[PDB]
Amino acid sequence: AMKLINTTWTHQELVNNQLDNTDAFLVETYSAGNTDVVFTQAPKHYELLISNKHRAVKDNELEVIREFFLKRKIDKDIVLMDKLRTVHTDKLIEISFPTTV
Ligand code: NA
Ligand code: NA
Secondary structure (H helix, E strand, O other): OOOEEEOHHHOHHHHHHHHHHOOOOEEEEEEEOOEEEEEEEEOOEEEEEEEOOOOOOOHHHHHHHHHHHHHHOOOHHHEOOOOOEEEEEOOEEEEEEEEOO
């Protein structure tokens, strides 16, 4: 089955572009097979950007990716879990996780 692979080490342009020009203070990238994930933390919000150049991203994929970040990467204690926002477009899913701090 499909595992999330941290690919940050070979996305150093993108990591730095996002750190220097955005409110993000953490930027990481991951593969989920041929699906690409960008994960960030900034004051007041974490973000996941999930996209797939070839195909629509499937619902079970979304669920596996989301629950991986929630379990491993996101401090749920500061997240506003009733205020999650998920924007679904054609080949792009955007999940916002507001935070107290
Ligand atoms: Na920044
Ligand atoms: Na963020």
